[PDB]
Design an enzyme around this catalytic site. Sequence first.
Site, PDB file in Angstrom:
ATOM      1  N   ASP A 287       1.168 -11.428   3.755  1.00 49.61           N
ATOM      2  CA  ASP A 287       1.082 -12.123   2.431  1.00 49.61           C
ATOM      3  C   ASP A 287       1.132 -13.402   2.509  1.00 49.61           C
ATOM      4  O   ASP A 287       1.625 -14.385   3.369  1.00 49.61           O
ATOM      5  CB  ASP A 287       2.322 -11.933   1.562  1.00 49.61           C
ATOM      6  CG  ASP A 287       2.675 -10.604   1.098  1.00 49.61           C
ATOM      7  OD1 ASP A 287       2.113  -9.561   1.516  1.00 49.61           O
ATOM      8  OD2 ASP A 287       3.475 -10.653   0.085  1.00 49.61           O
TER       9      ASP A 287
ATOM     10  N   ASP B 152       4.160  -1.400  -9.381  1.00 56.44           N
ATOM     11  CA  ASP B 152       5.582  -2.085  -9.315  1.00 56.44           C
ATOM     12  C   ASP B 152       6.526  -1.541 -10.098  1.00 56.44           C
ATOM     13  O   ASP B 152       6.547  -1.721 -11.484  1.00 56.44           O
ATOM     14  CB  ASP B 152       5.297  -3.512  -9.403  1.00 56.44           C
ATOM     15  CG  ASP B 152       4.303  -4.243  -8.326  1.00 56.44           C
ATOM     16  OD1 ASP B 152       4.191  -3.328  -7.152  1.00 56.44           O
ATOM     17  OD2 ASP B 152       4.147  -5.224  -8.383  1.00 56.44           O
TER      18      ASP B 152
END
Length: 241
Positions: free
Chosen positions: A11, A130
């Site tokens: 990330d 999510d």
Amino acid sequence: VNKLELLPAVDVRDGQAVRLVHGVSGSETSYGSPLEAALAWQASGAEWLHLVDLDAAFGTGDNRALVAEITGAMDIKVELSGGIRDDASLAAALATGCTRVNLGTAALETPEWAAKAIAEHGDRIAVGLDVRGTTLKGRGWTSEGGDLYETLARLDSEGCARYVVTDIGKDGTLTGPNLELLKNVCAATDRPVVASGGISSLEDLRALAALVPQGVEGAIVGKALYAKAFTLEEALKVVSA
């Protein structure tokens, strides 16, 4: 019976490799160069890189040139995610030469656009879900509540090839994956499911590997690798059993 695919994560925020807690902007722990990190995973035997542009995800500029550089340095498959929410961001991601991309908030906020992207790009698209409980979350999007299975059913009917399922409450916590969520999403769709969030141990990977027959195709591993709970070499060995 196929072996669980592992997708070590990188990330990127402000040009650095970082990990978040519950996906919250500002919770970053930093670990240095994301290019060096990606190359280390590849050298250890990774078949996949899961690469995320968090600046693009959060709307604070982007790391497009660096993400392209990292993808280009990979001889392995790359899954790219982060802020892919309109024609230009999707075009930029595809131009990296990545294997597939993930759409997240776009699937909630602009479902017609997402459906068109799926129709036009097929299995180069996966959708990230999510989840908290049965509620889907998105950046700058507020949910009505309890829409996981409705959304999954809609995306299935639109031909979505693949889902990345993250338990937000587990992400970056090292408290273990939500196996019960994963089992039920697998039960609800015949498309492959990639597990994400909370992996903390080799025992967690054995548990996920045991779900391959139910439809878990792979697992994204973030903080457990950066915080050295286990090595990628150990992880690859364990899922080869």
